[PDB]
Design an enzyme around this catalytic site. Structure first.
Site: not given
Lengths: 267, 276, 276, 267
Positions: A46, A121, A158, A163, A166
């Protein structure tokens, strides 16, 4: 008629899969450039796909990912299926679709002093490891909460498995059009994630007598955010184009990635 | 014409606000029916007007959707999310009711089907949430959650919520959900006390199908829609939740945006805002 | 000698493991009573031996504590937390039962009192959890949680769990609790789906008193202790949870430490461990 | 017969409260040293108290905090009550109690290469802002989980309202003896906090081919943690001594600090 091929490390240009691509496309009168056009084809995880996406957007052309190492969410196929994949690459018969991409503006004194974009992000984070970043988050021109925190994530559907996950966020399906905001370690009663229509404006005000803060987009592009600035994140006019194959739907990619218990399913 | 007025209780028909509504609309020769939170009660009306909290509002919205007309709500005591005004602005509100010049938007609604042995045995709808809940107080309900034709997780739980953006503030929030803006069209799934490592909320496009399978071996379970319409879910059956093609018609006034509603209801700290 | 054997169901008295127990102890002239998960059933016994899951174990522990004797458990199918061995090591276990040479430790238990108008109207105990739960399926129970004589939060909720370190893995986990080692002496409070900004788990010393007040205006509520002993909680009453002076006597074998039990039950990723 | 007085910034040595202390103790034949003995008396917030605690432990003597700015959890009184407070300081009639303190060892190649201590928390954190720190957490000589994360907090019951709280942890009462472990943004299904008896050993192994990581104790003392080390945190033999007055119990400090809704209480 050319294609860009992107691959993980420096030694990675010689592996079986890369080689197979270079052969098959040459033989078909398609020129091929190799890094790290009508398409950007990428071999790796990724993280490597994100890079390739970065170059596909400059050019305004589709990206198509083929996974090499441990599985992720972004590839349309795996290394075992490269022949099938290259057959669609030479033929150019694949579907292309626009995926929600974020625009970010850094504003100081009412003036745009920087900008960026993200398919995954925008990560706003504490500058110095001592202490907390004071922040005011605003949603549609109205303040929702002020707190100290390690940061604030503004993520696409997506980016929601990354993150943002998490940091405590929900899992969003990739065909959803929405924006996701996750406070990163907010020292507050209310530090829950929030999900907005894709038409909304998320703004984040950074304390004016604090330290400078940082923003990372897609884990790779870095802007300094000065004390007292306002970050504005909206849906960008320009989307990244994703090549789509006949691949596992996201639910299966989720189950596979986190080893999710699914026994007992009738259907 | 006519208007159906919904109030909380019988002895709320006599509140100062309720009295004002009757006077104003009576003066304009608008026939008023009154009722306390008749599936056909708003047949012929141009509006369902509600006074009370979010629960009273949900009853009125049912009656409005039965008749295919707008619902408009004014709140009384308890601060909420769904009313377009507070009691003190009842005169201003009544002005918009008499002139009939408010906007009307569609609010997303959920279709819910109960399927046994491949056929539909019950059906419901929701504007807030569908809540699948364990029958017995004792054990755990085993479910498999299936998203777009594909299994995502299996676990024991107290239940599973399937919520609209509007419902996200309600029982879904209590169970650990994210806050969604009522502006958004999406579907939210919140496992209710799932005994599992992964029991995270999931959010889906509005074209998604959410299915939940109920363990064949265990007890029957229950579905609550918007906190009031109950169906029994036979063991081994399966619940299917999608967007309903028929939306609720939502009257809008020039009112506070959802962000302000959230800050007010939860007393969210907000100091230092425009400072940059 | 005598031993009380507890099995899950009547038609579990005939399992291969259960058959072995009867043979071995019979050969050593140890009288065996058998029963399926008699408050005085283990009177005279030196041990309560259990075969089955964690729920069966909890029934056996009750009977053991009624008699003031150790409980020892061997698991059968479903992997759990409370058994000291698996079925395959039944011979080794029976050796320790016959020689009576296992260790016995105290496991912390909770005292629970129901108080109305200043006096005790019911009383219970728990080794796992006390679960205060809403009566009606409909609404919300209003509570005030009070920690050591002082209010900490008031909110509507499905309920409130007061759990031992041992119970933290159970229904408390489902509701969002932290994992506590069974080694620890503490009290854990987990609000169950609290409609509140602050509904976080709280952990207290074992000398603490946890009290919960039930709203005077609303419906009666329910308490479940270890998932089976039920009391009714009158509206306006108050629940008081403290450590009981009488512990359960917990037989121990040379068994897997809690950390391994956790990893195994939840399939926790553990690769690359000693690497540094 | 002396006392150490600690106060927030440099200009802070002249305020009404400091002055009042310097006067009253001098007049009573107690010498007084001023920074930033039988006691360390401190004026300021929790952050300033932590410092003072740091100097009280070197000397093995009690600390006693008096709050100046916005309220916290550690002070035994406020600035309005200084006379009452100084009356107990001159008289030396206050209770003293040991509070659970953490010992931390950094171990590389089986060898202790550094160490520290914390009354609040030990915060193990990512070194470089790009990426994730791979970690294996071990509880009583046995591995509990491996994951990538921003870090791992090991906190006392006292540190539980601080950074540990922001990272998703439960609230622990300060008279509890336990250790609290909170994964900081763990990319994993299981990243729940865990609470152990105070006798346990928490160890955290840092990936050997990752970057160096950092640990901050009580938000102020910093150790570098090299790639492939093992952090061991246990209860320290030596505790910090806390002066105790007749103060608000912790439940009231909690309610006050987070503005917790408590209406309807009968008692």
């Amino acid at each position: 008629r050319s294609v860009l091929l992107v691959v993980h490390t420096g030694r990675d240009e010689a592996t079986e899969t890369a080689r197979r691509v270079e052969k098959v496309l040459g033989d078909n009168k398609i020129a091929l450039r190799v890094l790290s056009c009508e398409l950007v084809l990428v071999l790796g995880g990724d993280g490597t796909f994100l890079r390739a996406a970065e170059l596909a957007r400059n050019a305004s052309i589709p990206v198509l990912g083929v996974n090499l190492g441990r599985i992720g969410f972004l590839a349309e196929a795996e290394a075992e299926a490269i022949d099938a994949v290259l057959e669609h690459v030479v033929a150019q018969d694949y579907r292309v679709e626009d995926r929600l991409t974020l625009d970010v503006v850094v504003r100081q004194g009412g003036r745009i002093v920087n900008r960026g974009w993200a398919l995954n992000e925008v990560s706003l984070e504490k500058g110095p490891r001592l202490g907390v970043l004071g922040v005011v988050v605003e949603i549609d021109g109205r303040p929702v909460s002020a707190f100290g925190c390690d940061g604030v994530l503004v993520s696409t559907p997506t980016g929601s498995t990354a993150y943002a996950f998490s940091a405590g966020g929900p899992v969003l399906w990739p065909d959803l059009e929405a924006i996701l905001v996750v406070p990163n370690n907010a020292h507050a009663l209310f530090g829950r994630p929030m999900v907005t229509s894709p038409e909304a404006t998320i703004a984040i005000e950074i304390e004016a007598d604090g330290h400078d803060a940082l923003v990372f987009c897609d884990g790779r592009r870095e802007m300094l955010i000065p004390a007292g600035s306002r970050l504005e994140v909206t849906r960008c006019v320009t989307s990244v184009k994703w090549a789509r194959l006949d691949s596992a739907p996201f639910t299966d990619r989720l189950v596979r990635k986190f080893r999710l218990p699914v026994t007992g399913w009738r259907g």
